[PDB]
Enzyme design. Sequence first.
Site, PDB file in Angstrom:
ATOM      1  NE  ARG D  32      29.636  -7.443  34.165  1.00 15.19           N
ATOM      2  CZ  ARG D  32      30.095  -6.261  34.595  1.00 15.19           C
ATOM      3  NH1 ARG D  32      30.690  -5.012  35.443  1.00 15.19           N
ATOM      4  NH2 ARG D  32      31.982  -6.969  34.658  1.00 15.19           N
ATOM      5  NE  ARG D  73      44.523  -9.229  38.273  1.00 18.06           N
ATOM      6  CZ  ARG D  73      44.772  -7.180  37.673  1.00 18.06           C
ATOM      7  NH1 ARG D  73      45.761  -7.156  38.092  1.00 18.06           N
ATOM      8  NH2 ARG D  73      43.634  -6.774  36.876  1.00 18.06           N
ATOM      9  CE  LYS D 220      33.868 -11.243  30.766  1.00 15.00           C
ATOM     10  NZ  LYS D 220      33.396 -10.015  31.775  1.00 15.00           N
ATOM     11  CB  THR D 278      34.193  -3.359  27.724  1.00 21.62           C
ATOM     12  OG1 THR D 278      34.789  -3.332  25.978  1.00 21.62           O
ATOM     13  CG2 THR D 278      34.386  -4.765  28.231  1.00 21.62           C
TER      14      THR D 278
END
Lengths: 464, 464, 464, 464
Positions: D32, D73, D220, D278
């Site tokens: 990855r 963000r 994802k 994760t």
Amino acid sequence: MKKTKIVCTIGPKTESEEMLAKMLDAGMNVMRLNFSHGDYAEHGQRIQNLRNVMSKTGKTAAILLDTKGPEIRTMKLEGGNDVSLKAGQTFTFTTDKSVIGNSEMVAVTYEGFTTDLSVGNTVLVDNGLIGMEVTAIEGNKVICKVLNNGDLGENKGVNLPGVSIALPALAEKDKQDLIFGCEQGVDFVAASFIRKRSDVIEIREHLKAHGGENIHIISKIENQEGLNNFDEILEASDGIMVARGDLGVEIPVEEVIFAQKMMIEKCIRARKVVITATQMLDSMIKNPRPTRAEAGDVANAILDGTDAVMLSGESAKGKYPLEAVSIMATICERTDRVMNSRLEFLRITEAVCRGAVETAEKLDAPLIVVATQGGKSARAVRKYFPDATILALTTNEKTAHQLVLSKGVVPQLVKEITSTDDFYRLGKELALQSGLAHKGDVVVMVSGALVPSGTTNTASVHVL
Amino acid sequence: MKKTKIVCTIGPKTESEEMLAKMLDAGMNVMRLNFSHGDYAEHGQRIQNLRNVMSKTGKTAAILLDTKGPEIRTMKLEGGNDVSLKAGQTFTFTTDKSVIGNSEMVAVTYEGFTTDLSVGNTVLVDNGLIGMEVTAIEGNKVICKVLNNGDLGENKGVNLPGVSIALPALAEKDKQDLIFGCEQGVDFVAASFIRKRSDVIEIREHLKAHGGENIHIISKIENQEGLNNFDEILEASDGIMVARGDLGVEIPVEEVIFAQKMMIEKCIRARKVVITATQMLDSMIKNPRPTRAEAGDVANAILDGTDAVMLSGESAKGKYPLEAVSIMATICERTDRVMNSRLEFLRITEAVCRGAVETAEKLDAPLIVVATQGGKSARAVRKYFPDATILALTTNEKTAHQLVLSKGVVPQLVKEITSTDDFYRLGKELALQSGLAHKGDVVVMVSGALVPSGTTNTASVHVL
Amino acid sequence: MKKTKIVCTIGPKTESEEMLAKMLDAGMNVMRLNFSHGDYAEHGQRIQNLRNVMSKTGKTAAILLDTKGPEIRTMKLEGGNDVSLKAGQTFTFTTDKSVIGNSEMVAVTYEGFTTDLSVGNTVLVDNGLIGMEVTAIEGNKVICKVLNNGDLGENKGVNLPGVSIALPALAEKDKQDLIFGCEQGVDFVAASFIRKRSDVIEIREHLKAHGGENIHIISKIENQEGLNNFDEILEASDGIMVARGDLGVEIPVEEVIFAQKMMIEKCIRARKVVITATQMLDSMIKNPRPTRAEAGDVANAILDGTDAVMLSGESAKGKYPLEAVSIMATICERTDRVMNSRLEFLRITEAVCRGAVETAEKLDAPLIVVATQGGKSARAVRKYFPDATILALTTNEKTAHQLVLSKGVVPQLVKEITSTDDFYRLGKELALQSGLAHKGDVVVMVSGALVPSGTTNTASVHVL
Amino acid sequence: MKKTKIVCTIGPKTESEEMLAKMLDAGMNVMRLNFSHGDYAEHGQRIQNLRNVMSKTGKTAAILLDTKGPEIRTMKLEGGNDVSLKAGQTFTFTTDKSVIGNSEMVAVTYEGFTTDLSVGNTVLVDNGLIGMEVTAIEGNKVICKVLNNGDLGENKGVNLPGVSIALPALAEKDKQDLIFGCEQGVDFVAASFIRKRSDVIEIREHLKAHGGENIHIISKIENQEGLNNFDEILEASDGIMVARGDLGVEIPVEEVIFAQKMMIEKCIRARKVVITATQMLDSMIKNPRPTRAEAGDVANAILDGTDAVMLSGESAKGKYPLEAVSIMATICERTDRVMNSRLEFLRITEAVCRGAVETAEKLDAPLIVVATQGGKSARAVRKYFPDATILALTTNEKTAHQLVLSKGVVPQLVKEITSTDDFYRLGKELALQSGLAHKGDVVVMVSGALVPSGTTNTASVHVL
């Protein structure tokens, strides 16, 4: 032992107490009295000898009354002699019942021949021996074109394949025999030439009108019209008798085997008793042993699933009637012992009765004990063809006799049943008494608890 | 389109090129030759007339030869007149073939009669008409006590129910007929009265010795001894014929029908052809329609799983050969179209073949195309009673013919098949050419790839 | 709505009557008391506060007593100061309990340290912080070579993976704690560090001697030896507690997930309760929401099939006690409702209980009502993960409390049940009173009729 | 060996040829590349050492590229100091990117903040640490009421539960990263923050527009919007990655576990690869041994059915990356050896590949060999979780790489395959060379014959 039940037509040679006692010993379960012949003193005495034998011997049986029924017949010819017909000739049926027949004309007993039939329909005489095509219809004569050669005799039956016939569901003589049935307290009534649901109800009315409400009605299917209305006819009857010989005169020969099979299957799915009859062991009226054919026919009838097989002339008038019952019992035992349960199939009764049969087989229970008032409970378990023998406990005398016809059922009348726990106690004692189970065997006990007589909802497993 | 195959015994009324073609139009698949009678000119002519009919039309069929076999028979009586034997009387059989019979003693055709028998055995004469009990045996006499009344005639067959018989497997004429079979290129050989595996092996030695190694031997089971040893006989045979009539005399009457079912079931699992024969539709020797009884018996043998049903006199010496076949073929279809697959039953050939049928069924494929050398592959599929038709491609002309007798197989001869991808091309083309599948239908194609004959290892799915 | 049950360790922040009342509103079912800490006045007070709330509210619950158990621990160091051990150094354990430790040697509390170990074993100190390998054993010393760096503290637990330890099954203090359990009438007793069946029997004896025949023993499996003898241990206990945390210290980390899955499934099969505990929602001791992981771990525990899930510090010594239980109830509710029945897996009790659940689903019965004395019958139904709720009617108060821990069960205590019909009457009333069923719903009722306590033999279906 | 595949995020401690070599020996399968950090030269070089390592040893792997993706963000605060936020207070976010923040207002990077949000929605900052409820929106500012205390730092992520977010489908930098991906020929691309099918299409257009047409898109799933549109996203993608960490913050915590399981099942049913990622073994960034929770979280992901498990920081920047992979392999194996086939589920590829697996198991074949060009063939067989290892023979070099990620699949590059019979020859030889099967073992071989790529229609059973 055998589970499939045996109907025996009782006649002059088998109406004695001594013979009936041995007729039961050999495997007979239901006595048939064919009112096509005989008189009320004859049958009433036959009824009495059986109830004498049962009372003294302790065996159980059922008594079935079979109606003559409606039918169409030819009449007499000149000089009372047969007449030979040739194909292609024109032939005529007449309504005038005063005419003596010949080579161009014969009389019939039913006037509705002209109205019910139409040009293009087929007419069959003497169990299909001679067939003819209707070409025109005029007044009091019926014109036909002969289809095949044959010898026409006097007073021969007539059949109209695939045609809706408008006969009365019962003849006046039938009505009187049925009334005699109620007075004698018969258990079953088999009704001939049932074609439509209206026919089944008319009998039910008449029995209701004279105290035959608790009498179970068995409708005899004999033609395509009955077959076409079979579903409705099953819904309205309490059971079915498949008269294979007669249907063979009415429908294509290769459909008859699939007509019998379907009807058995539909009676099974409906929890209604079914008798397979005619052309069973006919070759034994004169002979002491049957054909390879006859036994295989009977064996396929049990494998199809029938509750009962019926002996007719073989037992009422045959020369070797006791041998007929005995070999039938041997065929039934041999065939019954290799069949398997059918655990498929949302009623509460169906879910409970089907599960009890699976549980009986899951524990090798030799006996399933059932509490029943009207017998539906014993018949609900029977639908699943349990390896176990069904001992059905009741206080209703009619129920006990009627269950003599249901496959795998051993009826036992008891004084009373006070509760669900009492049923288990009483049934346990009786399971041992019946000799069909012994200490250490498991039994499954089916009853209805805190519900009406019409539902089965309880299953319990006990050790003897 | 029926799946069950029909064997017809061909005779004077059905041996013409014109008639045979009408028998094939009517559904005939296999010609049977009953070598009990007829001569090499007769049989050679039938074989040629068929191959003429086949050659011109393009229809395909098989040729089966049925043997007379060994047998025990009575002999001539005084003045050649019938004699009535009486129950309780003493009767005697003699070995001396020049002795004239009477009411107390008759000659027999088997010299070993005295040694084979024992005190207590039952002796049956003329298809069980008269039965006797052996009471003593000394030298050239067999002493018996007659059990039932009847007329003993001349040239009557003798049967020994429950008694092991030590005859030879072939007569000298049998040896000559088989060689004619090898010479003519017969496809099958039916062997009568098979009692033990050694009987079959003897025949194979004989047939291999004249270039008929590839000819299939179908063992006819005709007595109780064969039944006890059936398993070994099946292993040595290529197939079985169930002779219900002959067994009816040798074993208790309630056992026969299960002998048919049992024997048929084992043939299926072994991938070996099984024929149900004798007492099919006999009544059509004289009558243009069958009885209801016969058609139920016949069709229930199809439901049992039989590959083929056989006509004997109906088509050999009968009045209504075309009517017999047609009603037979109509029974086959009516019955075949309601039978389902049987997808149960660690081998490679079976796992692939059972998987090919299950896939074909789950994809509504009308057809299974099979590449085969000896037909073992086509008969492995047939075991599961697929709904889909089997198109069997072979380069071996004998196999193409032998595969005409198995249920649901349509054989097709081809020039060559060079590889697996080649088989798929050609097999797809031929599927469309046959008209049995059409553009877009799913076809399932089963073959052996990179393995010798006798194994089936590959299963493939194509859209047309 | 949820079916999985919640055990809560009750502590200072959750021992008040006002909290216990809100914890049950939030989903709590069972109180746990950790005899690892606290004294008889504290625990006895918690028991009183719960039973007061139960008395006032009418809600029901159980009391589970969890033992400290035996253990091996280090002892005191010089100046009570931490010491740093270095990988590769030699380190020594001593049996002499009067030795004060340092960086080269420390004492342990179990005198069998020298005998039980062998050269090559692994020694783990302070929940696996520090590892050591035994290199020699001399007199009262166990010599080792430290494998990884870390700070050794005072009073640190010791683990000996793969070693059969000869500790007593109960601590001398444990013996008194159990006696207190009897005095208070606790429902369950969870026993720590069960290694062998002999351990369980000693516990059962001890409860017998102080009136704890009715107290259910729940064996905590915590090491490899506990796991190896699991069957022998399960046969004697009434249930199991899976000690996930300790198992991580004793067996390879990849086996712990598969030790748990087994223990649940074997407890399910044995009709004996299983609790999943330790490392559940630890992060909620400090935080108002658990990890993403924690909720996933908890749900896979319910899917394995566990009866109950347990909270420790989350509810005993933590900031968000009601929020943790509430989210636990949310996981249980959400998880239980997509789980399915398990209708697989000779005896009578099993045959009926599996059939009752199969009957309940086929009739969409929302409730299965059971008459049970010792709880076994209600637990036998649960073995099949029924979709339906179980209403267990009993007269044994201990049973009524203990059954609060089995999944999907609602207890209700009654005065008596005098017969099988009486059971059905009351069950229908009490089924409706619970509000879990309505007019028209079907119920299935499981009982023992005319058999001693311990067998289930009757199942019955009623409409409300 | 294990069947489950391992994705590793590669970093400085794991980019050396010597370490990559040890990563593959330990079980690493897919590299990855996290484009959240790093530049094209660093990523290009890691790509280089792998393709160097693959060539030298001959061991194989695939290369996956993971996008940063669009995001919201916060930005910088006064003096770069953390600001402490308190429950109940008013806090405000602004669109103005030129504002420096403080304790009453901070700026956000997304211009659509005001338009997408609504009064009542939740705003979560920094892994959900601080949550706020919008109370009003005016001009470029969104006013909120803080729900919990916490310290807000600099440059922190923002999550908007349940909100359809109108950021672009790709960030501008991502387009260049994909273009870099097309340049390097990466096999897979993980595209972050996929919310709808249109998003996947923009990536697909972009990749094809730069020559990355054969690069598989692994979408994802991270928020609620994607989950609602998951079905289309899988349908539109080539595979899925379950990003549990992000989901833990966006949806109710008790839903996360079922979101993983559902998506894993749906990818299975679609024959599309699924990676679980994760929070796998995070504790090994700092520790040389994993947690029991982590060991159970992963092992339950494999039981769920995942194709792949992914290591992030564990292998990229952590102190024990090699130990992490090894234990990841020990878990995969320990779990892989207890899983069973799943043989349910009328398409041709489905019917054939499912049939080959049952036959493979019905014959205990250790190997199923599959001929594939586009890889579909191996992923259809793999779906049924066969015990046999899938030896996937292909001529497409990329395909060989792309199948390295698929569970249980062993890809093999071959020169050519000239026929169906050629495949059987070569496949038997290569099966033996591979060491996974041996002479005498059965092999099952799945190929497509006389059909376009994308269909698998042929199954063949061979002995080695």
